[PDB]
């Protein structure tokens with residue numbers, strides 16, 4: 001209950017500077033690519049082999065895996081700069097904007113802007129613009145510049161709304177069998193976004209486009225971590241509302257999805273990360 | 289210095305049955321596939337990106353990466369059965385056999401045998417035969433059964449010899465720039481087997497053939513860990529002789545330095561320099 005994770009829009013100009021800089025040091029040092037690599041590797045670790053589920057997505061472990069992923073990322077930020085925490089992108093109130101692409105998350109001091117359609121939607125404003133920041137493909141080889149193309153697809157012309165978030169929060173079951181992209185009455189799968197998708201989390205991905213629009217390479221965009229810090233906040237809220245409800249499956253789901261299974265590529269289990277305050281951080285909304 | 293890693297040949301028959309039965313349990317629960325995916329994952333972590341070094345192979349971290357790999361494998365064995373430790377395949381002794389396919393590591397008691405030519409060298413003896421042991425491919429999806437083909441290729445018709453291990457233990461530097469396949473006068477690159485390759489460790493892989501014959505999928509064959517436990521032994525012996533240390537200390541590509549994290553873990557080469565302090569020993573030491 002010590003590290004405060006703040007709304008992106010409520011950050012000072014100096015917090016934005018410090019956060020963007022630290023991400024660049026992680027990337028210069030070779031550390032950032034550990035996260036890209038981990039994310040792609042998890043998407044090829046199917047539970048069970050030959051299943052549609054993987055360690056990080058499309059199953060029950062979606063939420064705690066990303067919680068652990070962000071915790072490691074944030075710990076790496078703090079070794080470079082202890083006054084830096086992982087902010088969250090509250091996309092559901094950007095969606096209420098007249099033009100959500102006008103949100104200050106996309107200003108040249110922070111994430112940078114939409115892609116340049118003259119440059120095949122390469123990003124050229126902000127600290128991760130082409131030239132300043134090199135992306136990596138699934139094979140681990142340099143893949144050019146970061147790309148974004150906001151709202152360009154028919155399936156996801158808008159960010160999720162606050163009504164979308166509130167409605168996912170009424171769901172009482174953390175997850176339901178068969179613990180996959182077809183789970184019904186499942187807050188995991190509703191938040192993940194496969195319920196007549198892409199909704200919520202999956203929709204944000206498709207709305208941003210570029211690397212963000214395909215899951216394995218999505219973390220090539222630093223906004224991936226801000227996005228998932230929002231998802232993690234929403235999960236943390238659901239845990240406060242539905243305090244009697246617990247992770248599922250407790251047991252007899254596929255190996256790597258049960259409460260006490262290790263989450264590849266780590267030994268960390270869902271149980272280890274069930275209490276976010278226990279990991280040493282809160283979201284600013286929990287404190288007024 | 290409390291868990292003993294024994295030569296395969298010196299294992300009692302109850303030990304061989306216990307080793308094989310644990311590995312099949314690790315595979316049944318889903319745990320063995322974490323090592324298979326970890327190994328494929330680390331091959332596509334290139335240091336730096338776009339280069340041919342990767343996290344596990346073809347660079348300085350080859351030796352510490354596998355020692356950590358094997359230590360994690362042994363801990364998973366022990367958690368299922370605390371009597372089971374990781375044996376090592378001393379292939380340099382087996383090299384002197386006219387026909388090392390006759391070694392008792394390959395009995396139906398243990399790893400099973402060579403691939404069957406009539407069946408595209410599918411392994412059909414021992415506990416890991418087809419129908420008893422599933423393989424998975426580089427993309428991460430079920431493949432079609434263990435394969436082996438001892439000494440088939442012309443580059444690796446023979447196992448490496450006790451002569452080769454002694455010419456490796458002669459090199460005084462752990463490693464040398466550019467910390468890649470071309471590294472001259474390097475114990476690490478000599479033991480890995482790229483000088484006059486395929487030599488030593490690389491030779492064993494190409495000698496076995498089948499899944500062991502290609503970098504990323506080789507852990508599909510349980511003999512991968514017995515082989516690498518021997519590579520670990522040979523390194524552990526080197527660290528006695530040359531009470532030297534690891535290179536690069538700094539300024540190498542990230543993921544290769546003494547204090548870099550070894551993708552896909554946080555463990556550093558410094559973390560695993562002392563195998564006794566990790567809690568195990570080999571016999572004859």
Ligand SMILES: [Cu+2]
Pocket residue numbers: 039056057066
């Ligand atoms: Cu993800």
Ligand SMILES: [Cu+2]
Pocket residue numbers: 201205218227228
């Ligand atoms: Cu995501």
Ligand SMILES: [Cu+2]
Pocket residue numbers: 327344345354
């Ligand atoms: Cu290996």
Ligand SMILES: [Cu+2]
Pocket residue numbers: 489493506516
């Ligand atoms: Cu090997």
